[PDB]
Fold this sequence. Notes:
The structure is cut from a larger assembly and holds seven protein chains of seven kinds.
Chain B: H1 53-59, H2 71-79, H3 82-89, H4 93-104, E1 108-111, E2 122-126, H5 128-147, H6 157-167, H7 173-187
Chain D: E1 6-15, E2 21-28, E3 35-41, E4 49-50
Antiparallel strand pairs in D: 1-2, 1-4, 2-3
Chain G: H1 6-18, H2 27-37, H3 43-62
Helix pairs in contact in G: 1-3, 2-3
Chain F binds one RNA strand through residues 1-8, 10-15, 17, 21-22, 24, 26, 28-30, 35-40, 60, 64-73, 87, 114-125, 127, 129-138.
Keywords (chain G): Cytoplasm, Diamond-Blackfan anemia, Isopeptide bond, Nucleus, Phosphoprotein, Ribonucleoprotein, Ribosomal protein, Ubl conjugation
Main location (chain G): cytoplasm
Subunit structure (chain G): Component of the small ribosomal subunit. Part of the small subunit (SSU) processome, composed of more than 70 proteins and the RNA chaperone small nucleolar RNA (snoRNA) U3.
Amino acid sequence: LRITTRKTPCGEGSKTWDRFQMRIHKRLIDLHSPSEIVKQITSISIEPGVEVEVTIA
Amino acid sequence: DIKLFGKWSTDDVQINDISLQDYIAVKEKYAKYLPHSAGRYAAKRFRKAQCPIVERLTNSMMMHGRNNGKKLMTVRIVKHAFEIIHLLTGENPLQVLVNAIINSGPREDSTRIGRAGTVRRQAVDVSPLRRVNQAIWLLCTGAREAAFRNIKTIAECLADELINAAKGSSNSYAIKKKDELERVAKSNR
Amino acid sequence: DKLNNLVLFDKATYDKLCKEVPNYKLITPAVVSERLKIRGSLARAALQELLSKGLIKLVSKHRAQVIYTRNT
Amino acid sequence: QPIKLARVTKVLGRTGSQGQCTQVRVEFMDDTSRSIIRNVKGPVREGDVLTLLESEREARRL
Amino acid sequence: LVIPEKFQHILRVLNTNIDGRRKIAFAITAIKGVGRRYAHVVLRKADIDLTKRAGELTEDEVERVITIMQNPRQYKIPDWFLNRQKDVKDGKYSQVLANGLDNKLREDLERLKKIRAHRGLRHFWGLRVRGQHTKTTGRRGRT
Amino acid sequence: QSVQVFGRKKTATAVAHCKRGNGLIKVNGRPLEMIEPRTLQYKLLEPVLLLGKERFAGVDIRVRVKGGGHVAQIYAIRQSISKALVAYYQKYVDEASKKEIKDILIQYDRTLLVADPRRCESKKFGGPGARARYQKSY
Amino acid sequence: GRVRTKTVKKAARVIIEKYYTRLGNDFHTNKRVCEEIAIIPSKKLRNKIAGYVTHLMKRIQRGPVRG
RNA sequence: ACGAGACUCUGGCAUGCUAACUAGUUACGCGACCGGUCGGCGUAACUUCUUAGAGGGACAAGUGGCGUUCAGCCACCCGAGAUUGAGCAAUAACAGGUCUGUGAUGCCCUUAGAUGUCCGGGGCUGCACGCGCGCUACACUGACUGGCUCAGCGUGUGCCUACCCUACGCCGGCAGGCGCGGGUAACCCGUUGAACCCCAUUCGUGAUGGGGAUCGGGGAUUGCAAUUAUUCCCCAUGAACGAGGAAUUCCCAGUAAGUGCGGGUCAUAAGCUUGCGUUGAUUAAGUCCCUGCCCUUUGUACACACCGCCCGU
């Protein structure tokens, strides 16, 4: 997510541009398991910063 | 057994100048079917002179305005005007071009006066590499000015300018500017 | 007012168009248009007509760069 | 002046207001007893041959 | 080839100073109402050999071209490709030779100046109105 | 089944799927000579006459190429073809012939099987290009 | 420019001084021993130190080392 | 010790590894002639192209030359690469800009204009004018159906709001409307079918098919009215320009230049700007000549520091 803004809060100076970058990473796993076992598996150990979603395939 | 394009041979060419033969490449391993190869010649010294002479000559063809960066158009206008010189003369175009370069590459001209000085100019030897650079530049520029404001189109001015430079006709821009450079060299002793 | 170059197949056009031109190896529309003082379009038309007459073989032509090669 | 080629034998250095001339020792392959300083123009390597229709002039040196 | 009779050098459609050396559809562009694209369409519809100039042709071709020109609606030319479609006062019909309707489309401009309208008076003053900004115009040869 | 060899130039990339055959060469629905430019055609023909038609007579390689630009799509077809031939020979028949063809290709063009590392450089603000800068008045 | 920095030069000096016995004439072995015997947080810095280590070893092969 | 470097992200190589019906390479029922085009399919060889995850790889490492025989520089077999590009970036400062970001702010407005609510309309879109960035042109290396071949960055279904990208058929040469919807996205646009290279038919040295107020009339968006109307598809004319006398920006290899696309712009709105591929250069391996800046020595009666100080009438 490259987005570029002007450094100065005014118009004075040289053309200076902040180039802010946010990177988003995606993982997918597909399993053959009943919903109870998947639910038990998911909430066994997590660390803040990752978003986990369970979807029907 | 490599031939330029499809019919030009690289065994009938001879330098017979000894001055600029390592900076002209038509007979050695630098033989190829297409005057379009990009390459890394212009990224280091001692490697810029290994580019084939026809490759450099077609590289310097495009210039001015949108015409720059159209190397394929240069390949077309080089196969053209080369068919034209071969039909006009009947001789091998590569040897004619080498003759034009030998006749057009200046030998001596003026720069700054030795240790220091800028009021006037002092005559010095021209390197073979800079002289082939100058010869190619004059060839291209004379051709494009000959096309400039003229009824005749491209692939003609290249052809006639090259053939006059090979023969020495004053209508050639390359060798007339050559003689001009040596006249400045003489006048600035 | 306007510069005059012949846009018709005229007496000067018909003269030295099929007998003396092949004696010169350089056969291109610009040279013809300069020799007999016509436009480029008429020179291209004349070379196309003489090609259709089955006189001289073709080498190439993109839009206006056409090459004719003799046999003698 | 007699025509006699000279081959580069050592690249002395750079001179000129903008540093474009190059001092280089050039030797004539006729007696190998003469090795004169020549200022030259343009990209000059070591070991090429410089055509010389004029040799009565010398480059500033020493 | 050489035509032995009736070669013209000053071609004339209607009080128009046009060249006879010019190619057909390259000289008839002098009409102040139609030309270029409309001319090409009209001559391609009238079945004229484009590969010929404006002198190596018979009079019938020019006659029928003029007839189809002065009567666009009679010969399958739509009411979208032309510049006299209905407008103020009364709708305009028939595009005729030279400034036969260019005078008609300048007299509406005259009306716009005579009624004292903002757009009209800006047309009178020499200030273009269709969206033209003014920052460097009217700087060379201004009064 | 491919020799798994690929070939690149600029952002373009080409791979020659390889199988036992009789030297029929095809590039994405077309053989090696009907490629459109007809002036870059010599660039595509470079290998097949650089080493001869006989070497391209006992292996069927189909070159699939994905990338930008015409000429950048070239220098990928040809390099992929040459390096696919060299890898096929190396892994199947022997090395002596493979070594001979590799030496031939390198001598003609050292960048015949190595990729060209150069890529378009990023653009920095205050200028249109990588190294060009906006004009200003003093 | 390829001039070594006093950080790389100083670390290579300390490595030669303290761990001479393990260090050899090959660059790659120098890299491995420098990784094993010291905490060098950057692969590039490891490699610069190993290269200076190799050059220093060649210098001792010449004979005396001044530094 | 800080800064430089180191650092991080990037650009390039691993047929080595963890592996992927949101990607393809391999799995075949016209085998269309008796060994073949597929993304015209003729409806379970597994990660090689694609995907950035962990390691590896380059270090002046080997050779030669120069060099305190140091630090290093130059040339080469080899190697993907022998200098990728950026980000950050010290001490001190400038009366540089910003009170047009806010109870984050030190002063006036308190007596019915105290803005905390509000505007119907015009302003920076209009001018005798000089200036600054950039585009369209400078030709027959250019054009007059363009007929056939591709990628790159990356954006997109919204609760302050139909306010998205839109695939497919219907309405018309046209801006636009209808439907079924595909896409919350490597699931759809998209295999992102533009710039280009071609041509065994048509421009030919004009002021013009190299060109724009091609003057004026035909157009319109499930949303306040397109008024010197910043939106718009159609139909000739024309100003002007023959490389632009001074003065000169900016340019070290996928660099300059050659063009198109995507965001910020945005209810429609790119000559701007910010990124992106797309073609590939004679040119430079140098220097202090100019313009500056830094350092050293030197002089100083300056220290508010030469925009200083100071003398006399």
